[PDB]
Amino acid sequence: STGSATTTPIDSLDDAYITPVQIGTPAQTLNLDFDTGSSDLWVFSSETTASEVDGQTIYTPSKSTTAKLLSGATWSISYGDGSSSSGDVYTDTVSVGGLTVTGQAVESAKKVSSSFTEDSTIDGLLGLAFSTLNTVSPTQQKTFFDNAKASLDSPVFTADLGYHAPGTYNFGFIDTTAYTGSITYTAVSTKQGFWEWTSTGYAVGSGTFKSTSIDGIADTGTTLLYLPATVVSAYWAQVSGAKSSSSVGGYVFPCSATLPSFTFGVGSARIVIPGDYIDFGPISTGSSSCFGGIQSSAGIGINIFGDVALKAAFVVFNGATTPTLGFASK
């Protein structure tokens, strides 16, 4: 089997992407944030504290003939941005882009933090990291991909995120029309539960490439590119007036700037992030200070190849017995 679903930016900045997901019988379609940096499929639901729901579409398990309480199971998750959610668990039929999994753990939120409430466009998350990170207790649950894997034509999914435009998540096949040139594959460590890999270096604009190993994670659920402070300083030094602002929470730059590109290495291959991808617009409405899309990972504890990086590439998440990651230009 295979699946193919379009993923759509939630706003004009590509802050996140939503993908429609069918849950239950008859189908309830919710728009979920596919997150290769976590491993829980959770939804706003009929159980979510009413004051914490503001415009989201909810899953109502009592209206699904295939829903079953997973008795005694609870979940609770905290994300890198400080947001969180928790609740109980149902199993139900879940379909993405025509690919169906029966008996998927659907984690029903009883509570969500303010950031989730305030974002009316995201109805929940669909985790695509390794199932070892799943938070369900006392019986850890598998991701949608892990459950689907055996049925897939090939044990892979791909992320093809758009810049200010829709893109695609495919399951079970590689669309050879969706990228240019060849795909370069690189080793993955699953030791921390992430799609963790080592970039071979970087360049700023038309500058020379610096060969240096940068360990980080491919994380579709993180908006920006977070890299070591040395790398980030080298990038922003090429933008007149750019500076790190503790009050704003990162590097800002004059909105009048033209940003240089940023290149990262994948083996001997190179992925170029155009300068425009690094512009996250005014820090507050009408400001002439703009927020940068490359930020320091210092104090996160890990480097993160988030959407800014991934949307410059066609990315293969190869879930074979020895997982790997592939990157192609597009």
Among 308, 159, 148, residue whose Cα is nearest residue 227? 308
Chain center to CA of 232: 21
Q: Determine the Cα–Cα distance for residues 147 and 210; give it in Å rounded to an integer.
A: 40
Judge contact between 227 and 213, C-beta under 8 A: no
| Residue 114 backbone phi and psi in degrees, to 5 | -60, -35
Alpha helices in the chain (DSSP H): 114-117, 144-148, 229-236, 307-310
- Resolution of this PDB entry, in A? 1.2
Amino acid at 52: E
Judge contact between 266 and 252, C-beta under 8 A: no
Among 157, 184, 325, residue whose Cα is nearest residue 268? 184
Q: Determine the Cα–Cα distance for residues 77 and 43; give it in Å rounded to an integer.
A: 12
In terms of Cβ atoms closer than 10 Å to its own Cβ (0-12, 13-18, 19+), residue 316 is: buried
Tell me the CA distances in angstroms from 48 to 57, 74, 214, one per residue in order: 11, 14, 40
Judge contact between 242 and 257, C-beta under 8 A: yes
Q: How many CA atoms lie within 13 A of 2 on its CB side?
A: 13
Tell me the CA distances in angstroms from 303 to 170, 198, 284, one per residue in order: 25, 10, 26
Residue 326's region, left for phi above 0, alpha for psi from -120 to 50, else beta, is beta
Catalytic residue among 35, 123, 219, 307: 35
**Length of the chain as a residue count:** 330
- The DSSP line for 208-273 is PPEEEEEEEEE-TT--SEEE-HHHHHHHHTTSTT-EEETTTTEEEEETTPPPPPEEEEETTEEEEE
Catalytic residue among 64, 85, 86, 199: 199
Q: Which residue has the tokens 């799943």?
A: 134
Q: Determine the Cα–Cα distance for residues 210 and 166; give it in Å rounded to an integer.
A: 32
Method: X-ray
Judge contact between 70 and 89, C-beta under 8 A: yes
Using DSSP's 3-state secondary structure scheme, residue 77 falls into strand
Judge contact between 143 and 129, C-beta under 8 A: yes
Read off the tokens for 77.
């998750």
Q: Is 182 a catalytic residue?
A: no
Q: Determine the Cα–Cα distance for residues 157 and 170; give it in Å rounded to an integer.
A: 5
H or E element at residue 158: strand 156-160
In terms of Cβ atoms closer than 10 Å to its own Cβ (0-12, 13-18, 19+), residue 57 is: middle
Domains of the chain (ranges plus CATH)?
A: 5-174 (2.40.70.10), 175-330 (2.40.70.10)
Q: Determine the Cα–Cα distance for residues 199 and 222; give it in Å rounded to an integer.
A: 18
In terms of Cβ atoms closer than 10 Å to its own Cβ (0-12, 13-18, 19+), residue 328 is: buried
Q: What is the dihedral of CA 227, 273, 16, 223, to 10 degrees?
A: 10
Judge contact between 169 and 313, C-beta under 8 A: no
Tell me the CA distances in angstroms from 150 to 23, 193, 235, one per residue in order: 20, 20, 43
Chain center to CA of 73: 25
| Residue 220 backbone phi and psi in degrees, to 5 | -70, -20
Q: Is 245 a catalytic residue?
A: no
Residue 283's region, left for phi above 0, alpha for psi from -120 to 50, else beta, is alpha
